[PDB]
Paper text:
Very recently, tropinone biosynthesis has been investigated, and it has been shown that the key intermediate 4-(1-methyl-2-pyrrolidinyl)-3-oxobutanoic acid (2)18 results from an atypical type III polyketide synthase (PKS) AbPYKS catalyzed condensation between 1 and malonyl-CoA, whereas tropinone is formed by a P450 enzyme AbCYP82M3-mediated oxidation and cyclization of racemic 2. Herein, we report the characterization of three PYKSs, AaPYKS, DsPYKS, and AbPYKS, from three respective plants, Anisodus acutangulus, Datura stramonium, and Atropa belladonna as well as the condensation mechanism based on the crystal structures of AaPYKS. In this study, we clearly demonstrated that AaPYKS only takes one-round of malonyl-CoA condensation to form free acid 5, and then undergo the non-enzymatic Mannich-like condensation with the substrate N-methylpyrrolinium to afford 2. There is no reported type III PKS that takes one round of sole malonyl-CoA condensation in natural product biosynthesis, thereby, PYKS may represent an emerging class of plant type III PKSs.
The overall structure of the dimeric AaPYKS-COB is highly homologous to those of previously reported type III PKSs. The surface exposed characteristic CoA-binding tunnel reaches into the inner active center, where the conserved catalytic triad C166-H305-N338 resides as those in other type III PKSs. Surprisingly, we observed a large electron density extending from the thiol moiety of C166. Inspired by previous structure of pentaketide chromone synthase (PCS) showing a co-purified CoASH in the active center, we suspect that the AaPYKS-COB prepared from E. coli cells probably utilized the endogenous malonyl-CoA to yield a reaction intermediate covalently bound to the thiol group. To confirm our hypothesis, we explored the possible covalent modification on C166 of purified AaPYKS-COB through mass spectrometry. The results in Supplementary Fig. 11 clearly show the presence of a C166-containing peptide with an additional mass of 128 Da, corresponding to exact mass of a 4-carboxy-3-oxobutanoyl (COB) moiety. The crystal structure of AaPYKS-COB also graphically explains the limited round of elongation AaPYKS could catalyze. In the structure, the 4-carboxy-3-oxobutanoyl moiety is stabilized by multiple polar interactions with R134, H305, N338, and S340 and hydrophobic interactions with M139, F217, L256, and L258. Notably, R134 and S340 make a salt-bridge and hydrogen bond interactions with the carboxy group of the thioester, respectively, which serves as a gate to prevent entry to the buried pocket near the active center, and consequently inhibits further chain elongation. Alanine, threonine, or serine substitution of R134 resulted in significant decrease of activity, highlighting the key role of R134 for AaPYKS-catalyzed one-round malonyl-CoA condensation.
Author numbering:
A (entry chain A): 11 to 391
B (entry chain B): 16 to 391
């Protein structure tokens, strides 16, 4: 089965999109404390500058503009009722951003959009019924008989989940072509600063906005489709008691953020057993023989995974590039990284979409200390 | 090594329940609305037309008394609804799951996948994660968490579990649909009479199924086969049926056009699903219909010319539990095979071979699942 052409699920195209508005990380402490009327919190601001400095983020794209914040001062408070305005923004803007990424993926794929048979939409940024998947069908002009799955409120690990899901959809449905969209916005969790909640500043420094789209299918059409990656395997686990360490709740004040200082080291010390379970059946034990896609949950996690696994320093370069240029875009990050890794492969004149290597690993993680591990195979560049 | 099979079905409800005949009195009393005499009479008529006899509910008089925002029409209430539901929804799902696992009779450690479905609250990590903890399963169970889907999603979960079971050798999927009207319960308002429909209709419950291909001879006993599953929607359906999650909890928008629009679109779904099997006589099937309300049941029966007993299991579940959103069609699957055994019929599908399960929900989404019965 893994050896057939009516065989494994393949990534056939990748497209990405961001809101046009962006903000530079160097000037974000000034922007944030000004627009939330918090410049009198001098010590807190300096704390925020240090946090922003340690992120290794250079810019983030943002659906939320100064004009929107000024029209909606509840957004600038720490915890006044704000879910309704976040929903009004996100229920409209998330499918539109997903549409932009989808159009770029469909353009690369170069097949008619009417041959898409399935749609998977993933976001933790707002919820509605019918969902963003339904809205996206309307915005893209697809037919009502596209088979939809709407994945709400998943969080940072869910790019790996969507690959896991897409693999089964593509492999069990002859001819199926799956449009998968991860679209995320920090507008669900943006809030003003508070000296009694300093830990929330981490979230305000980290999260950015963006959407990624992929086309997934088995049995590629010769001379028409050009596979980018093969999804070899995908598996989920979690670290027991991880929900005490990493969790987010949807409340009247929007999305909250609970993340302890234990999170980076606990993730880092659990990734090797995930790698072994996924890669030992393929006879791979040298993690530097792989290309790498890592969810950049924060810079500390990237560094600690590199150090715990003994990866060469350039292995996580594509990951660091995406963290630098876009910040943490939750489930969409690993798909931006997937796109980046093949783009960088072409720039460096390498011979496969995976930095000239055959096998790769995509590892994501999120609430509950859930970890998703996807083994990938590259394709000729 | 073939089709996905339903290997077991279990169901559970909150212990607290209210009879529909006395619900107008309960509802207007506990929300301090007895001065709205004409509105109470409208509500009596609405409750009368539901054909619902009882509903189970997580929300008790004590909880309402302690949380008067719940008894208002639109004061901020999402936080208390979340505090209740984030805890109670996985526990209710666990009760249904234990009953399904008991019927299945295999060790719970051999479950490989978990699909959890609810529109009643959201959290990260989700109710799926909580359920793993409550059931004592391992962290390596493969989870999919389906939040905020709505009434059609029992059909969706079948569609999804079919692919999980058929593409993963040996996989055994625990699928849970757990729902509570506590997300949308609110007091009455004379400027929002249409919300009384929702207050009359929704109830609480959870259903669990085990799905897998390649059953173990002499150990597993298949109940149904999932032959095929397909989704569609009626264009512009979101103008007729939609629910928004707000600071006041879940809202409800449902026009009077919903029952006839659904009823007039089901036949094309049936034809697309069943023509490839060479079936065109809808009375040769057993039937599972999402009882979105009594009017939809009647209008589907009438538009398709079904014999009146075809939708009996559907009406039984509407009567005994009300509209439990995505869980309804799985209660009805359980009920149709129980009624088959009671009537001494020879298959789990009222003695017939092929059946159809049809659900519908927000956006006028319609899910159509073709089922095959099994020996009783
Ligand atoms: O904000 C989210 O999507 C949840 C999460 O786990 C962040 C990571 O990193
Ligand atoms: O309340 C829900 O779960 C949404 C819906 O579509 C009700 C049907 O009937």
């Amino acid at each position: 089965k893994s050896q057939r052409s009516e065989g494994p699920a393949l990534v056939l195209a990748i497209g990405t999109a961001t809101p046009s508005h962006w903000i530079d990380q160097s000037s974000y402490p000034d922007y944030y404390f000004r627009v939330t009327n918090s410049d009198h919190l001098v010590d807190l601001k300096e704390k925020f500058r240090r946090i922003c400095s340690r992120t290794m983020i250079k810019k983030r794209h943002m659906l939320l503009t100064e004009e929107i914040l000024k029209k909606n001062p509840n957004l600038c408070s720490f915890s006044e009722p704000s879910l309704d305005i976040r929903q009004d923004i996100l229920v409209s803007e998330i499918p539109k951003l997903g549409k932009e990424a989808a159009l770029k993926a469909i353009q690369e794929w170069a097949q008619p959009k009417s041959t898409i048979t399935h749609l998977v939409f993933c976001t933790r940024s707002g919820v509605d019924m019918p969902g963003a998947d339904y809205q996206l069908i309307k915005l893209l002009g697809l037919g009502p008989s596209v088979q939809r799955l709407m994945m709400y409120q998943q969080g940072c690990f869910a790019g790996g989940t969507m690959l896991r899901l897409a693999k089964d959809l593509a492999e069990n449905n002859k001819g199926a072509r799956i449009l998968v969209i991860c679209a995320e916005s920090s507008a669900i969790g943006f809030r003003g600063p508070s000296e009694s909640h300093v830990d929330n500043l981490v979230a305000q420094a980290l999260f950015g906005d963006g959407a990624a789209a992929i086309i997934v299918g088995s049995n590629p059409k010769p001379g028409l489709e050009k596979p980018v990656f093969e999804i070899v395997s995908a598996a989920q686990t979690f670290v027991p008691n991880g929900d005490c360490h990493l969790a987010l709740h949807l409340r009247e004040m929007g999305l909250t953020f609970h993340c302890t200082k234990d999170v980076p080291p606990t993730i880092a010390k659990n990734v090797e057993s995930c790698l072994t379970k996924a890669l030992e059946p393929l006879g791979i034990s040298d993690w530097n023989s792989l290309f790498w896609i890592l969810h950049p949950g924060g810079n500390a996690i990237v560094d600690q995974v590199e150090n715990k696994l003994g990866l060469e320093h350039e292995k996580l370069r594509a990951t660091r590039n995406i963290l630098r240029d876009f910040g943490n875009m939750s489930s969409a990050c690993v798909l931006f990284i997937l796109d980046e890794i093949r783009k960088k492969s072409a720039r460096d004149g390498l011979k496969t979409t995976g930095e000239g290597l055959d096998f790769g690993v995509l590892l994501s993680f999120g609430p509950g200390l859930t970890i998703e591990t996807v083994v990938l195979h590259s394709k000729p560049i």
